[PDB]
Amino acid sequence: VYAQNWVGSTLLPPNISFREFQSLANIVNKVPNENSIENFLDLCLKLSFPVNLFTLLHVSMWSNNNFIYFIQSYVSKNENKLNVDLITLLKTSLPGNPELFSGLLPFLRRNKFMDILEYCIHSNPNLLNSIPDLNSDLLLKLLPRSRASYFAANIKLFKCSEQLTLVRWLLKGQQLEQLNQNFSEIENVLQNASDSELEKSEIIRELLHLAMANPIEPLFSGLLNFCIKNNMADHLDEFCGNMTSEVLFKISPELLLKLLTYKEKPNGKLLAAVIEKIENGDDDYILELLEKIIIQKEIQILEKLK
Amino acid sequence: DISSLPPQIIKREYDKIMKVVFQAVEVAISNVNLAHDLILTSLKHLPEDRKDQTHLESFSSLILKVTQNNKDTPIFRDFFGAVTSSFVYTFLDLFLRKNDSSLVNFNIQISKVGISQGNMTLDLLKDVIRKARNETSEFLIIEKFLELDDKKTEVYAQNWVGSTLLPPNISFREFQSLANIVNKVPNENSIENFLDLCLKLSFPVNLFTLLHVSMWSNNNFIYFIQSYVSKNENKLNVDLITLLKTSLPGNPELFSGLLPFLRRNKFMDILEYCIHSNPNLLNSIPDLNSDLLLKLLPRSRASYFAA
């Protein structure tokens, strides 16, 4: 109680030995408070000598309120800038504690220093979780860049709207091998509606055009999930219209029928590019398809005997 | 086959057209989606020459009936948000005057049927600003939303104003609006952003004429001085001295927190005037070491200390 007041209010001697200076610094490092912090800044503006202050001023050991008040009143008086020493502090403390980063985002959203915000999210993205009223416009411009490997592998840990604007980045970054490896946490988004049924249709457009040229694995897992929600005609009838020969020869027989059987004339024009594989095409592909029509009894679609 | 009706006719006999539409929705309250898109389109086509108080209150009186028969359910709530936000957006200047009878009376009806009143009013504001993205500044919209005293609108205002970077071209009309928000929800981060703003200004505007800091709590008044004096000129400008000379002598809590700063900054007359106007300060100070009192010479009021 006496120390916080003496140190935060007595005028300091402009001749103070290095031996005294280290002692004064250790007092503030034990009783971190508004005035004991402030009067320790009102000295540094006048030092006719070098020395990093952090080697005796272990702000990474301080409580979060004191760390915040320290950086605020440091930067405001010194140069409104981040010198080297201040970067090396921040890159060890904020990745070790999300609570510490909370009031710290405001000051970085003000004076920008964009390269700092890139490094914390690149060490761990679970920082985006507990943000006050987080929005699009912002998160779309905070492209995570940390490989989509972290974001798709945890997509369920977001909110609602953020699911749409995440997949909007995965596509526009060509992150193919991240929509695939985590497909099961993605199907449950397009299923559950959203804050904008409009962004769904444009996302579904960006999916089919890349799937047609790149079967990989989700061509089956996706196109199955498409027809279990017949609220997709504005994409199925396009998919059957944009067809190319080698694309059809990778359609699973369990799926080519489950597309056309729960449909009529519109999806039916897909048959145009199936003639290439029945007539003069492939011996065993015709026979794997012929199982499915007989086992389920899909007779109205059997009208193809010429 | 029904290829709409030409835009002239809709604008012309609008007041005849909408009679039947209102009566259809007053019976169709059973079908949420039917009532929802009818309102959205009738507003999206509502002509400028009809953007008055009568047509405004009519849509409010329609939504009232629909909402009182139903209940807060996820499906009902999120459509109701998009409907009501489009209604306020269509009439926006008629809700954004400075007293707005329509604004406040509307909130007192929506609070009747929700899982939390403080989500319904807030998610309203968040949709309205997602519509108005270049026509109307957030400040003017927030200026009237805080006249509700809705504690969840205050929370989001502190989160925005304390952290969004401000435009170096801001009209005086925006500047006064942003200032009035801080005069209702003053907080550490909201003050710190306004300073990083004034440091980048092209115009002088002696700030105190808009800030009214002597109305803010003791912590708010303290923290404002610390960052302002240091970022500005390491000293006080006219209005600060005239402020401090009459806020401090009447409040001992504020005096106790500012006393160390005024001491380390050598502000002699500032300290002396407080003792000359209020001698009781010297016995409410914790740890008045005899060296401090020998340097806080009473000067005037010698006729008080011996007495």
Side-chain angles (χ1 to χ4, degrees), chain A residues 2 8-9 34-35 38-39 42 69 72 76-77 80 106-107 109-111 132-133 135 137, chain B residues 126 133 156 159 163-164 188-189 192-193 196 199-200 223 226 231 260-261 263-264 287:
Chain A
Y2 187 58
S9 75
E34 158 279 337
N35 258 297
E38 273 254 304
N39 204 39
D42 296 344
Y69 202 97
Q72 286 178 341
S76 70
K77 302 179 214 290
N80 265 352
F107 205 104
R109 205 156 90 82
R110 289 155 40 202
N111 299 307
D133 288 279
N135 57 341
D137 193 352
Chain B
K126 288 156 64 181
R133 289 305 299 151
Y156 183 57
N159 293 320
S163 70
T164 289
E188 164 270 332
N189 262 294
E192 250 301 275
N193 197 6
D196 294 352
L199 181 144
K200 303 176 186 117
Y223 188 73
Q226 309 189 268
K231 293 181 183 178
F261 191 91
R263 170 148 57 128
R264 64 187 150 90
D287 192 37

mmCIF file of all heavy atoms in Angstrom, chain A residues 2 8-9 34-35 38-39 42 69 72 76-77 80 106-107 109-111 132-133 135 137, chain B residues 126 133 156 159 163-164 188-189 192-193 196 199-200 223 226 231 260-261 263-264 287:
data_model
loop_
_atom_site.group_PDB
_atom_site.id
_atom_site.type_symbol
_atom_site.label_atom_id
_atom_site.label_comp_id
_atom_site.label_asym_id
_atom_site.label_seq_id
_atom_site.Cartn_x
_atom_site.Cartn_y
_atom_site.Cartn_z
ATOM 1 N N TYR A 2 1.907 1.332 0.812
ATOM 2 C CA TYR A 2 2.812 2.487 0.861
ATOM 3 C C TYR A 2 3.665 2.565 -0.417
ATOM 4 O O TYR A 2 3.772 3.631 -1.028
ATOM 5 C CB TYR A 2 3.648 2.372 2.146
ATOM 6 C CG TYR A 2 4.553 3.551 2.505
ATOM 7 C CD1 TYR A 2 4.021 4.847 2.686
ATOM 8 C CD2 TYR A 2 5.922 3.332 2.766
ATOM 9 C CE1 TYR A 2 4.837 5.893 3.158
ATOM 10 C CE2 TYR A 2 6.745 4.383 3.228
ATOM 11 C CZ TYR A 2 6.198 5.669 3.439
ATOM 12 O OH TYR A 2 6.973 6.682 3.916
ATOM 13 N N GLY A 8 4.401 5.741 -7.446
ATOM 14 C CA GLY A 8 3.466 6.340 -8.401
ATOM 15 C C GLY A 8 3.314 7.862 -8.311
ATOM 16 O O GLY A 8 2.387 8.400 -8.915
ATOM 17 N N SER A 9 4.142 8.570 -7.528
ATOM 18 C CA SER A 9 3.885 9.986 -7.223
ATOM 19 C C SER A 9 5.092 10.854 -6.841
ATOM 20 O O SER A 9 5.024 12.075 -7.001
ATOM 21 C CB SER A 9 2.848 10.044 -6.103
ATOM 22 O OG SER A 9 3.391 9.706 -4.838
ATOM 23 N N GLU A 34 -2.097 1.219 -11.777
ATOM 24 C CA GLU A 34 -2.171 2.345 -12.721
ATOM 25 C C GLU A 34 -1.015 3.359 -12.564
ATOM 26 O O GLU A 34 -0.270 3.583 -13.519
ATOM 27 C CB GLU A 34 -3.588 2.943 -12.602
ATOM 28 C CG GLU A 34 -3.753 4.399 -13.068
ATOM 29 C CD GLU A 34 -3.317 5.437 -12.034
ATOM 30 O OE1 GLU A 34 -3.297 5.109 -10.818
ATOM 31 O OE2 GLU A 34 -2.923 6.542 -12.471
ATOM 32 N N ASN A 35 -0.800 3.907 -11.363
ATOM 33 C CA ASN A 35 0.210 4.949 -11.131
ATOM 34 C C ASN A 35 1.651 4.429 -11.036
ATOM 35 O O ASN A 35 2.574 5.119 -11.474
ATOM 36 C CB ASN A 35 -0.182 5.750 -9.876
ATOM 37 C CG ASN A 35 -0.809 7.083 -10.244
ATOM 38 O OD1 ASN A 35 -0.188 7.953 -10.856
ATOM 39 N ND2 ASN A 35 -2.043 7.292 -9.884
ATOM 40 N N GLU A 38 2.367 4.039 -14.681
ATOM 41 C CA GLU A 38 2.478 5.332 -15.377
ATOM 42 C C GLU A 38 3.778 6.102 -15.087
ATOM 43 O O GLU A 38 4.450 6.531 -16.026
ATOM 44 C CB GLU A 38 1.285 6.221 -15.002
ATOM 45 C CG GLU A 38 0.040 6.022 -15.887
ATOM 46 C CD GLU A 38 -0.155 7.201 -16.850
ATOM 47 O OE1 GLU A 38 -0.237 8.356 -16.355
ATOM 48 O OE2 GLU A 38 -0.179 6.966 -18.085
ATOM 49 N N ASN A 39 4.167 6.255 -13.816
ATOM 50 C CA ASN A 39 5.380 7.002 -13.449
ATOM 51 C C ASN A 39 6.660 6.292 -13.948
ATOM 52 O O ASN A 39 7.663 6.947 -14.230
ATOM 53 C CB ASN A 39 5.365 7.232 -11.922
ATOM 54 C CG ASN A 39 6.187 8.437 -11.467
ATOM 55 O OD1 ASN A 39 6.213 9.486 -12.090
ATOM 56 N ND2 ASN A 39 6.836 8.358 -10.328
ATOM 57 N N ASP A 42 6.888 7.747 -17.575
ATOM 58 C CA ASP A 42 7.284 9.158 -17.502
ATOM 59 C C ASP A 42 8.802 9.374 -17.270
ATOM 60 O O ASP A 42 9.300 10.487 -17.492
ATOM 61 C CB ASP A 42 6.428 9.890 -16.440
ATOM 62 C CG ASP A 42 4.917 9.964 -16.760
ATOM 63 O OD1 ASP A 42 4.529 9.724 -17.927
ATOM 64 O OD2 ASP A 42 4.149 10.326 -15.833
ATOM 65 N N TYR A 69 -2.904 -2.235 -19.662
ATOM 66 C CA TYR A 69 -2.624 -0.850 -19.265
ATOM 67 C C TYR A 69 -1.170 -0.441 -19.575
ATOM 68 O O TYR A 69 -0.909 0.678 -20.022
ATOM 69 C CB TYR A 69 -2.963 -0.706 -17.770
ATOM 70 C CG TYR A 69 -3.231 0.728 -17.342
ATOM 71 C CD1 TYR A 69 -4.559 1.198 -17.264
ATOM 72 C CD2 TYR A 69 -2.164 1.599 -17.049
ATOM 73 C CE1 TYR A 69 -4.825 2.539 -16.918
ATOM 74 C CE2 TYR A 69 -2.424 2.938 -16.710
ATOM 75 C CZ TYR A 69 -3.748 3.418 -16.667
ATOM 76 O OH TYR A 69 -3.938 4.730 -16.394
ATOM 77 N N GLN A 72 -0.874 0.041 -23.612
ATOM 78 C CA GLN A 72 -1.611 1.266 -23.943
ATOM 79 C C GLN A 72 -0.761 2.509 -23.674
ATOM 80 O O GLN A 72 -0.468 3.293 -24.585
ATOM 81 C CB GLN A 72 -2.899 1.349 -23.107
ATOM 82 C CG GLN A 72 -3.978 0.367 -23.581
ATOM 83 C CD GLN A 72 -5.242 0.427 -22.722
ATOM 84 O OE1 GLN A 72 -5.260 0.910 -21.599
ATOM 85 N NE2 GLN A 72 -6.349 -0.028 -23.258
ATOM 86 N N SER A 76 1.396 5.047 -26.568
ATOM 87 C CA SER A 76 0.881 6.423 -26.614
ATOM 88 C C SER A 76 1.917 7.523 -26.348
ATOM 89 O O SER A 76 1.749 8.630 -26.854
ATOM 90 C CB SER A 76 -0.250 6.563 -25.588
ATOM 91 O OG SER A 76 0.232 6.517 -24.262
ATOM 92 N N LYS A 77 2.962 7.235 -25.555
ATOM 93 C CA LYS A 77 3.975 8.212 -25.106
ATOM 94 C C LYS A 77 5.299 8.101 -25.867
ATOM 95 O O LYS A 77 6.022 9.085 -25.963
ATOM 96 C CB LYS A 77 4.232 8.041 -23.593
ATOM 97 C CG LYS A 77 2.979 8.195 -22.710
ATOM 98 C CD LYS A 77 3.303 7.985 -21.219
ATOM 99 C CE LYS A 77 2.158 7.329 -20.431
ATOM 100 N NZ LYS A 77 0.968 8.186 -20.231
ATOM 101 N N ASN A 80 4.006 5.790 -30.875
ATOM 102 C CA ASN A 80 2.777 5.267 -31.506
ATOM 103 C C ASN A 80 3.030 4.097 -32.487
ATOM 104 O O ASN A 80 2.308 3.884 -33.464
ATOM 105 C CB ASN A 80 1.913 6.414 -32.075
ATOM 106 C CG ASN A 80 0.819 6.888 -31.128
ATOM 107 O OD1 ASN A 80 0.545 6.328 -30.080
ATOM 108 N ND2 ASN A 80 0.095 7.916 -31.493
ATOM 109 N N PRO A 106 -8.963 -4.575 -29.871
ATOM 110 C CA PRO A 106 -9.302 -3.159 -30.042
ATOM 111 C C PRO A 106 -8.140 -2.262 -30.487
ATOM 112 O O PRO A 106 -8.230 -1.605 -31.526
ATOM 113 C CB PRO A 106 -9.861 -2.734 -28.681
ATOM 114 C CG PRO A 106 -10.590 -3.985 -28.200
ATOM 115 C CD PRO A 106 -9.731 -5.122 -28.756
ATOM 116 N N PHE A 107 -7.013 -2.280 -29.770
ATOM 117 C CA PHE A 107 -5.854 -1.423 -30.058
ATOM 118 C C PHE A 107 -5.218 -1.742 -31.431
ATOM 119 O O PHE A 107 -4.799 -0.842 -32.163
ATOM 120 C CB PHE A 107 -4.856 -1.573 -28.893
ATOM 121 C CG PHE A 107 -3.923 -0.386 -28.699
ATOM 122 C CD1 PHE A 107 -4.157 0.515 -27.638
ATOM 123 C CD2 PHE A 107 -2.817 -0.182 -29.550
ATOM 124 C CE1 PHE A 107 -3.296 1.610 -27.433
ATOM 125 C CE2 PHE A 107 -1.955 0.913 -29.338
ATOM 126 C CZ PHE A 107 -2.191 1.810 -28.279
ATOM 127 N N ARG A 109 -7.089 -3.178 -33.922
ATOM 128 C CA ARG A 109 -8.159 -2.843 -34.870
ATOM 129 C C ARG A 109 -8.166 -1.340 -35.183
ATOM 130 O O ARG A 109 -8.468 -0.978 -36.316
ATOM 131 C CB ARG A 109 -9.481 -3.437 -34.342
ATOM 132 C CG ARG A 109 -10.508 -3.690 -35.464
ATOM 133 C CD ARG A 109 -11.547 -4.768 -35.086
ATOM 134 N NE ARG A 109 -12.761 -4.245 -34.426
ATOM 135 C CZ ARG A 109 -13.815 -3.706 -35.013
ATOM 136 N NH1 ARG A 109 -13.850 -3.409 -36.277
ATOM 137 N NH2 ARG A 109 -14.877 -3.413 -34.339
ATOM 138 N N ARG A 110 -7.667 -0.524 -34.242
ATOM 139 C CA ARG A 110 -7.343 0.912 -34.352
ATOM 140 C C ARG A 110 -6.046 1.208 -35.123
ATOM 141 O O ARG A 110 -6.111 1.676 -36.254
ATOM 142 C CB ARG A 110 -7.307 1.511 -32.931
ATOM 143 C CG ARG A 110 -8.710 1.609 -32.305
ATOM 144 C CD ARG A 110 -8.707 1.593 -30.767
ATOM 145 N NE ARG A 110 -7.608 2.379 -30.172
ATOM 146 C CZ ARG A 110 -7.087 2.249 -28.970
ATOM 147 N NH1 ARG A 110 -7.522 1.387 -28.091
ATOM 148 N NH2 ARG A 110 -6.097 3.023 -28.669
ATOM 149 N N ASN A 111 -4.866 0.923 -34.556
ATOM 150 C CA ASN A 111 -3.549 1.289 -35.137
ATOM 151 C C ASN A 111 -2.937 0.215 -36.074
ATOM 152 O O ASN A 111 -1.804 0.296 -36.539
ATOM 153 C CB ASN A 111 -2.629 1.811 -34.017
ATOM 154 C CG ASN A 111 -3.240 3.055 -33.370
ATOM 155 O OD1 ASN A 111 -3.590 4.023 -34.041
ATOM 156 N ND2 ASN A 111 -3.489 3.021 -32.081
ATOM 157 N N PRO A 132 -16.868 -10.798 -29.188
ATOM 158 C CA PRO A 132 -18.080 -9.978 -29.067
ATOM 159 C C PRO A 132 -18.742 -9.680 -30.424
ATOM 160 O O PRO A 132 -18.150 -8.990 -31.250
ATOM 161 C CB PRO A 132 -17.642 -8.686 -28.358
ATOM 162 C CG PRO A 132 -16.376 -9.080 -27.602
ATOM 163 C CD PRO A 132 -15.755 -10.147 -28.500
ATOM 164 N N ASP A 133 -19.956 -10.208 -30.645
ATOM 165 C CA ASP A 133 -20.799 -9.977 -31.835
ATOM 166 C C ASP A 133 -20.038 -10.052 -33.179
ATOM 167 O O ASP A 133 -20.191 -9.187 -34.043
ATOM 168 C CB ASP A 133 -21.654 -8.707 -31.658
ATOM 169 C CG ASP A 133 -22.791 -8.901 -30.644
ATOM 170 O OD1 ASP A 133 -23.841 -9.477 -31.038
ATOM 171 O OD2 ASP A 133 -22.610 -8.497 -29.472
ATOM 172 N N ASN A 135 -18.773 -10.777 -36.902
ATOM 173 C CA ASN A 135 -19.438 -10.587 -38.170
ATOM 174 C C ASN A 135 -18.573 -10.953 -39.392
ATOM 175 O O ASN A 135 -17.341 -10.831 -39.419
ATOM 176 C CB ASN A 135 -19.948 -9.132 -38.223
ATOM 177 C CG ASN A 135 -18.885 -8.048 -38.040
ATOM 178 O OD1 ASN A 135 -17.785 -8.232 -37.539
ATOM 179 N ND2 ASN A 135 -19.191 -6.831 -38.427
ATOM 180 N N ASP A 137 -18.173 -9.385 -43.428
ATOM 181 C CA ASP A 137 -17.353 -8.215 -43.814
ATOM 182 C C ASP A 137 -15.930 -8.320 -43.211
ATOM 183 O O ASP A 137 -14.956 -8.415 -43.961
ATOM 184 C CB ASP A 137 -18.093 -6.871 -43.550
ATOM 185 C CG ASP A 137 -17.482 -5.611 -44.186
ATOM 186 O OD1 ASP A 137 -16.363 -5.687 -44.746
ATOM 187 O OD2 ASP A 137 -18.144 -4.543 -44.126
ATOM 188 N N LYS B 126 -28.709 -5.180 -35.770
ATOM 189 C CA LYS B 126 -27.695 -5.910 -36.547
ATOM 190 C C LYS B 126 -28.169 -6.252 -37.963
ATOM 191 O O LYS B 126 -27.346 -6.237 -38.877
ATOM 192 C CB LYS B 126 -27.275 -7.166 -35.768
ATOM 193 C CG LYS B 126 -26.417 -6.789 -34.541
ATOM 194 C CD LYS B 126 -26.443 -7.847 -33.435
ATOM 195 C CE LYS B 126 -25.836 -9.197 -33.818
ATOM 196 N NZ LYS B 126 -25.950 -10.137 -32.680
ATOM 197 N N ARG B 133 -25.702 -0.405 -45.891
ATOM 198 C CA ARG B 133 -24.230 -0.569 -45.940
ATOM 199 C C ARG B 133 -23.451 0.577 -46.586
ATOM 200 O O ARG B 133 -22.224 0.581 -46.458
ATOM 201 C CB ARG B 133 -23.842 -1.928 -46.562
ATOM 202 C CG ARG B 133 -24.154 -3.134 -45.657
ATOM 203 C CD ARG B 133 -23.536 -3.052 -44.247
ATOM 204 N NE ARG B 133 -22.053 -2.988 -44.210
ATOM 205 C CZ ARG B 133 -21.323 -2.404 -43.272
ATOM 206 N NH1 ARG B 133 -21.886 -1.691 -42.332
ATOM 207 N NH2 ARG B 133 -20.022 -2.535 -43.231
ATOM 208 N N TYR B 156 -23.283 -3.786 -27.314
ATOM 209 C CA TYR B 156 -22.774 -3.829 -28.684
ATOM 210 C C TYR B 156 -22.200 -2.477 -29.136
ATOM 211 O O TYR B 156 -21.168 -2.449 -29.808
ATOM 212 C CB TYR B 156 -23.888 -4.337 -29.606
ATOM 213 C CG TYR B 156 -23.481 -4.497 -31.064
ATOM 214 C CD1 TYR B 156 -22.394 -5.326 -31.411
ATOM 215 C CD2 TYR B 156 -24.201 -3.836 -32.081
ATOM 216 C CE1 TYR B 156 -22.019 -5.484 -32.760
ATOM 217 C CE2 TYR B 156 -23.841 -4.007 -33.435
ATOM 218 C CZ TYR B 156 -22.746 -4.832 -33.776
ATOM 219 O OH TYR B 156 -22.397 -5.004 -35.078
ATOM 220 N N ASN B 159 -18.637 -2.338 -27.837
ATOM 221 C CA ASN B 159 -17.820 -3.218 -28.682
ATOM 222 C C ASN B 159 -17.468 -2.580 -30.037
ATOM 223 O O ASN B 159 -16.322 -2.695 -30.482
ATOM 224 C CB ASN B 159 -18.532 -4.575 -28.871
ATOM 225 C CG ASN B 159 -18.637 -5.376 -27.583
ATOM 226 O OD1 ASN B 159 -17.727 -5.420 -26.775
ATOM 227 N ND2 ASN B 159 -19.726 -6.066 -27.338
ATOM 228 N N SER B 163 -13.451 -0.058 -30.907
ATOM 229 C CA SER B 163 -12.525 -0.883 -31.699
ATOM 230 C C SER B 163 -12.551 -0.697 -33.222
ATOM 231 O O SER B 163 -11.545 -0.983 -33.871
ATOM 232 C CB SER B 163 -12.747 -2.357 -31.324
ATOM 233 O OG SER B 163 -13.987 -2.872 -31.773
ATOM 234 N N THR B 164 -13.644 -0.227 -33.827
ATOM 235 C CA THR B 164 -13.685 0.084 -35.270
ATOM 236 C C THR B 164 -12.891 1.365 -35.573
ATOM 237 O O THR B 164 -13.174 2.410 -34.995
ATOM 238 C CB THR B 164 -15.145 0.185 -35.766
ATOM 239 O OG1 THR B 164 -15.762 -1.089 -35.796
ATOM 240 C CG2 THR B 164 -15.297 0.703 -37.195
ATOM 241 N N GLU B 188 -13.529 2.669 -21.236
ATOM 242 C CA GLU B 188 -12.078 2.671 -21.495
ATOM 243 C C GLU B 188 -11.726 2.614 -22.996
ATOM 244 O O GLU B 188 -11.186 3.586 -23.527
ATOM 245 C CB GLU B 188 -11.482 1.518 -20.659
ATOM 246 C CG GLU B 188 -10.057 1.068 -21.030
ATOM 247 C CD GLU B 188 -10.022 -0.055 -22.089
ATOM 248 O OE1 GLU B 188 -10.974 -0.866 -22.179
ATOM 249 O OE2 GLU B 188 -9.039 -0.073 -22.860
ATOM 250 N N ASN B 189 -12.125 1.555 -23.709
ATOM 251 C CA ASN B 189 -11.801 1.398 -25.132
ATOM 252 C C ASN B 189 -12.481 2.443 -26.039
ATOM 253 O O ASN B 189 -11.885 2.884 -27.023
ATOM 254 C CB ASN B 189 -12.134 -0.041 -25.566
ATOM 255 C CG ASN B 189 -10.893 -0.919 -25.562
ATOM 256 O OD1 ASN B 189 -9.964 -0.715 -26.339
ATOM 257 N ND2 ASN B 189 -10.838 -1.936 -24.744
ATOM 258 N N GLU B 192 -10.353 5.542 -25.750
ATOM 259 C CA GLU B 192 -9.045 5.333 -26.390
ATOM 260 C C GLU B 192 -9.084 5.427 -27.931
ATOM 261 O O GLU B 192 -8.133 5.913 -28.544
ATOM 262 C CB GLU B 192 -8.470 3.975 -25.932
ATOM 263 C CG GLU B 192 -7.252 4.078 -25.002
ATOM 264 C CD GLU B 192 -6.087 4.834 -25.642
ATOM 265 O OE1 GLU B 192 -5.286 4.208 -26.380
ATOM 266 O OE2 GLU B 192 -6.008 6.074 -25.489
ATOM 267 N N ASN B 193 -10.184 5.011 -28.568
ATOM 268 C CA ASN B 193 -10.380 5.155 -30.016
ATOM 269 C C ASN B 193 -10.605 6.622 -30.434
ATOM 270 O O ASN B 193 -10.014 7.091 -31.405
ATOM 271 C CB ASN B 193 -11.559 4.256 -30.435
ATOM 272 C CG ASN B 193 -11.630 3.990 -31.935
ATOM 273 O OD1 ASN B 193 -10.771 4.350 -32.724
ATOM 274 N ND2 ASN B 193 -12.650 3.301 -32.370
ATOM 275 N N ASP B 196 -7.194 8.349 -30.639
ATOM 276 C CA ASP B 196 -6.510 7.931 -31.872
ATOM 277 C C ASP B 196 -7.153 8.511 -33.145
ATOM 278 O O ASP B 196 -6.497 8.541 -34.189
ATOM 279 C CB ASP B 196 -6.466 6.398 -31.983
ATOM 280 C CG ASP B 196 -5.619 5.688 -30.923
ATOM 281 O OD1 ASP B 196 -4.896 6.332 -30.132
ATOM 282 O OD2 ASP B 196 -5.649 4.434 -30.948
ATOM 283 N N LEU B 199 -6.112 12.784 -32.821
ATOM 284 C CA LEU B 199 -4.702 12.802 -33.224
ATOM 285 C C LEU B 199 -4.497 12.857 -34.753
ATOM 286 O O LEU B 199 -3.422 13.226 -35.217
ATOM 287 C CB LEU B 199 -4.074 11.542 -32.592
ATOM 288 C CG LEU B 199 -2.563 11.345 -32.847
ATOM 289 C CD1 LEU B 199 -1.909 10.740 -31.602
ATOM 290 C CD2 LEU B 199 -2.288 10.380 -34.012
ATOM 291 N N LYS B 200 -5.513 12.481 -35.544
ATOM 292 C CA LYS B 200 -5.491 12.407 -37.015
ATOM 293 C C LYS B 200 -6.427 13.439 -37.674
ATOM 294 O O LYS B 200 -6.686 13.337 -38.873
ATOM 295 C CB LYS B 200 -5.797 10.957 -37.463
ATOM 296 C CG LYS B 200 -4.826 9.918 -36.863
ATOM 297 C CD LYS B 200 -5.208 8.477 -37.237
ATOM 298 C CE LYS B 200 -4.308 7.465 -36.498
ATOM 299 N NZ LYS B 200 -5.076 6.594 -35.569
ATOM 300 N N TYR B 223 -9.487 8.487 -16.729
ATOM 301 C CA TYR B 223 -8.774 7.818 -17.819
ATOM 302 C C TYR B 223 -8.680 8.679 -19.091
ATOM 303 O O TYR B 223 -7.638 8.727 -19.744
ATOM 304 C CB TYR B 223 -9.465 6.469 -18.072
ATOM 305 C CG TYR B 223 -8.711 5.595 -19.057
ATOM 306 C CD1 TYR B 223 -7.507 4.984 -18.656
ATOM 307 C CD2 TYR B 223 -9.175 5.432 -20.376
ATOM 308 C CE1 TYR B 223 -6.740 4.251 -19.583
ATOM 309 C CE2 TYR B 223 -8.416 4.692 -21.304
ATOM 310 C CZ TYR B 223 -7.171 4.128 -20.921
ATOM 311 O OH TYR B 223 -6.390 3.483 -21.827
ATOM 312 N N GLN B 226 -5.605 11.138 -18.806
ATOM 313 C CA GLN B 226 -4.286 10.480 -18.862
ATOM 314 C C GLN B 226 -3.789 10.353 -20.310
ATOM 315 O O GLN B 226 -2.711 10.838 -20.680
ATOM 316 C CB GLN B 226 -4.343 9.077 -18.210
ATOM 317 C CG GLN B 226 -4.974 9.086 -16.811
ATOM 318 C CD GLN B 226 -4.832 7.756 -16.083
ATOM 319 O OE1 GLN B 226 -5.698 6.894 -16.149
ATOM 320 N NE2 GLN B 226 -3.749 7.547 -15.370
ATOM 321 N N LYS B 231 -0.918 12.141 -25.340
ATOM 322 C CA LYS B 231 -0.954 12.045 -26.818
ATOM 323 C C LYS B 231 -1.048 13.402 -27.535
ATOM 324 O O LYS B 231 -0.766 13.456 -28.728
ATOM 325 C CB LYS B 231 -2.125 11.152 -27.272
ATOM 326 C CG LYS B 231 -1.977 9.669 -26.889
ATOM 327 C CD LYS B 231 -3.184 8.862 -27.410
ATOM 328 C CE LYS B 231 -3.118 7.382 -27.001
ATOM 329 N NZ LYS B 231 -4.298 6.601 -27.452
ATOM 330 N N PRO B 260 -2.251 12.059 -7.971
ATOM 331 C CA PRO B 260 -0.907 11.598 -8.336
ATOM 332 C C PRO B 260 -0.437 12.145 -9.692
ATOM 333 O O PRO B 260 0.697 12.608 -9.792
ATOM 334 C CB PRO B 260 -0.994 10.070 -8.363
ATOM 335 C CG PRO B 260 -2.177 9.751 -7.447
ATOM 336 C CD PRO B 260 -3.117 10.901 -7.777
ATOM 337 N N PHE B 261 -1.313 12.164 -10.708
ATOM 338 C CA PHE B 261 -1.002 12.682 -12.047
ATOM 339 C C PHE B 261 -0.674 14.179 -11.976
ATOM 340 O O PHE B 261 0.389 14.603 -12.428
ATOM 341 C CB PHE B 261 -2.172 12.410 -13.017
ATOM 342 C CG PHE B 261 -1.838 12.659 -14.485
ATOM 343 C CD1 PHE B 261 -1.337 11.601 -15.269
ATOM 344 C CD2 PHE B 261 -2.022 13.927 -15.081
ATOM 345 C CE1 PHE B 261 -0.993 11.805 -16.618
ATOM 346 C CE2 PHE B 261 -1.696 14.125 -16.440
ATOM 347 C CZ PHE B 261 -1.173 13.067 -17.210
ATOM 348 N N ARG B 263 0.310 15.891 -9.414
ATOM 349 C CA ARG B 263 1.586 15.951 -8.691
ATOM 350 C C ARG B 263 2.784 15.692 -9.615
ATOM 351 O O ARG B 263 3.624 16.586 -9.727
ATOM 352 C CB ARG B 263 1.525 15.034 -7.451
ATOM 353 C CG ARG B 263 2.892 14.854 -6.763
ATOM 354 C CD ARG B 263 2.807 14.672 -5.237
ATOM 355 N NE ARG B 263 1.956 13.535 -4.810
ATOM 356 C CZ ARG B 263 2.286 12.551 -3.984
ATOM 357 N NH1 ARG B 263 3.495 12.395 -3.535
ATOM 358 N NH2 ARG B 263 1.397 11.683 -3.588
ATOM 359 N N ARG B 264 2.875 14.541 -10.302
ATOM 360 C CA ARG B 264 4.041 14.223 -11.165
ATOM 361 C C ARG B 264 4.171 15.135 -12.392
ATOM 362 O O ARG B 264 5.280 15.339 -12.872
ATOM 363 C CB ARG B 264 4.140 12.714 -11.489
ATOM 364 C CG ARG B 264 2.992 12.105 -12.317
ATOM 365 C CD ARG B 264 3.156 10.573 -12.409
ATOM 366 N NE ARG B 264 1.873 9.853 -12.516
ATOM 367 C CZ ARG B 264 1.221 9.523 -13.615
ATOM 368 N NH1 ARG B 264 1.606 9.804 -14.821
ATOM 369 N NH2 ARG B 264 0.112 8.856 -13.536
ATOM 370 N N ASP B 287 -2.181 9.201 3.435
ATOM 371 C CA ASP B 287 -0.722 9.414 3.537
ATOM 372 C C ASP B 287 -0.209 10.774 3.016
ATOM 373 O O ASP B 287 0.633 10.878 2.119
ATOM 374 C CB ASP B 287 0.064 8.209 2.995
ATOM 375 C CG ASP B 287 1.552 8.290 3.367
ATOM 376 O OD1 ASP B 287 1.862 8.758 4.488
ATOM 377 O OD2 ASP B 287 2.365 7.807 2.551
#
